[PDB]
Amino acid sequence: ADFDAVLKCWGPVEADYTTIGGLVLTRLFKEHPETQKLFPKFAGIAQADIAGNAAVSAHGATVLKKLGELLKAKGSHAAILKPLANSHATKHKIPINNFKLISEVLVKVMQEKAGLDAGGQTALRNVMGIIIADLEANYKELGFS
């Protein structure tokens, strides 16, 4: 049910993955500047120059499309998340806590831009908690507990 609650507000997100993706990453980097350093392509870009940066927005679109794919999955969520865990632990070297930070940002962006109400905010926190716990379990399988 919590997946359906989020999907009932996903229209404005999927309508413009570039704009909303850029909003999410711009806010992440503003509120959590240490996360920007985990993207070598973006690390060191002055904060004032991030909102207008097309490459940042394009990467945010990649993130949100992957999250959409997960939400819409009629099969295993864990299966889609295994490659994501593998790349984020072993290629990008992203500590798990950073997924909680981007999930905090997404809840706020959907509250502000996608009509996600109080119950929807809780549903999205629950869904992101499922995703993050699966990423964390897969990190542990790789030796990154």
Ligand code: HEM
């Ligand atoms: C649930 C949240 C996230 C989703 C859905 C997501 C999704 C993706 C996808 C689909 C890619 C491209 C394919 C791949 O390399 O696996 C990617 C790349 C990447 N992600 Fe994430 N990601 C998330 C969170 C994060 C966080 C929190 C960070 C760092 C704070 C991060 C850092 C990176 C980096 C550095 C790349 C490589 C970018 C490039 O070289 O172009 N990701 N992510």
